[PDB]
Amino acid sequence: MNLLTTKIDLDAIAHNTRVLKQMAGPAKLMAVVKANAYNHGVEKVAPVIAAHGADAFGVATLAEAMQLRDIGISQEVLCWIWTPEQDFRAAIDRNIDLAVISPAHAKALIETDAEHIRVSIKIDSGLHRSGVDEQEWEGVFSALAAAPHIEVTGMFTHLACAPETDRQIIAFRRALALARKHGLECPVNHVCNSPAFLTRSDLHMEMVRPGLAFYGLEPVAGLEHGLKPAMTWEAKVSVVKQIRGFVAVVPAGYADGMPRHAQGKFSVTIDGLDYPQVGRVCMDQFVISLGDNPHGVEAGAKAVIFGENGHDATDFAERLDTINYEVVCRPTGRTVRAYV
């Protein structure tokens, strides 16, 4: 028996997958499962998402993409954070699509002697982060077009989460036209992350790549989509102490993902009732006040930090002055992952 765990509801994930598949329509559905499926356990999550419609998967690193192939994912897989200094050839060998994020990346790929290399051009559409920018488009498209063994499956841009969006699309379309003018068909393109996907059907293109929504969380406040949250972070009270007040100790500290800054900003839920966190969050635990403990909370009681039978990830996120993306990624350390 574990005192600290995250409950991962796989059925909720399948549901979310079905809801996203219906919403995508004719567009392909790429499931973004980087960061170990947003901390939900990609080894279990990805197969469920695959079994319910996902046309492809998107991850950040070479290692994550390779892990997907390891568990048996046979769908198209895209990786966008790697450098020519790494063994990217190992990914190519595993049928992993690689994003061209800079001229140097394009160069390393063209100079790679492999039969057929699938690549997707990451376009810097204005954020000035990663990706090939306007001044480099000409050279890169020309170089990739001249490479026999390279197949440019398309291009994509990451609508940084923002007006801003439409300005990015204009630049992206300028790049796509320039690419095709160079002989690059760019058959499958995508720009939609969860927020854009759930609000801009005009930007579906040939493929959409939402991440957050698969885990049942809403990207924009005020919007309903019938999603089912999949993660619940909960601990079992280790000790109930009487000071006629009482406090309870819950076996979770900053070493487990509970920020020290969360002090005095939230409550956990025991049997559906809230109890405010009090005092300093320590390395292995934090304390909550039971008041006169009228409901008779005892050691062993289940305390929901966020999730089922408690406050959802979004509420907890706002209490912590952050976003739900970060809260689901927080549970770590002694926290054990349990499915459904």
Next chain:
Amino acid sequence: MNLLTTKIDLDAIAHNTRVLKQMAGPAKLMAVVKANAYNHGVEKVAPVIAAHGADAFGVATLAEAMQLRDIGISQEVLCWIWTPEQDFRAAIDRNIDLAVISPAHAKALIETDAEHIRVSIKIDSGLHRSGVDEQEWEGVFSALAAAPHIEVTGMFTHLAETDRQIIAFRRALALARKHGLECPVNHVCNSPAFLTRSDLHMEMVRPGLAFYGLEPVAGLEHGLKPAMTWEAKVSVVKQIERGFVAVVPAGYADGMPRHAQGKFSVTIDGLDYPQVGRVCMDQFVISLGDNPHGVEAGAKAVIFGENGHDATDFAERLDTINYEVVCRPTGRTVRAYV
């Protein structure tokens, strides 16, 4: 090659152990290696510490305790965060000391059908968290003393006042002995109290932080050597103006909090470059100005540690403590030993 890693200096840890072993004198040295040895990798760290003098090891959970036995640690082991509902019996069968942190824990142990159970009494000396409080002294000591299959090896408490907690701890110790509990080996010193209160060493000291080379009291040195370095390789350098920015392969899913925005910089070739903009899930951006030093993709960016700001400095910049920063590197971060 990995774009994001923690470099763990095992020789530094051996060094820190020797230092702490010296300062401990006749007092037993129990190294705290809970939380995977403060995120330094207990499977490699604990053996080094044991090989250099540690008399015992302290961890929080049964699983962490069992993990020490699994790696072959033969020293005394104490575990202080568990409940009667867990299979603590399996831990007793592997010679793992259990802390009595409430009357119910004492009850469970007393009712456990085992021949010899080594226990340490966790004393609530005023903090009012876990541990047995003064109102419970009597009942617990008297019950444990009447159970011959249990060996009360001693008692301990945790410092937040300090002297105040000590006064209380002493009272409990006296009552326990009055009840027939000898309490041969007691302890209260964590890293800060150990380095400054030689009068509180007692029979055993319980340092954690110091073994990893970090100083608890920002004021003076003790000759420790920091053991961890968190660093990344620039993935791309982009022109934004004639200014440039560089993308660093680490986000809040890897341990870099979104709140860290505008609070820090990374060190590249000994010089600092400010993080700017929003911290995303997989990466953050730094400002290079006109990039006078020609930083290129592939460059080594030290977040904290060797060739960068030490953990304490980084912790202050992010409004936290060094204990938390060494626990932060996670996600795609790959641990490497040097």
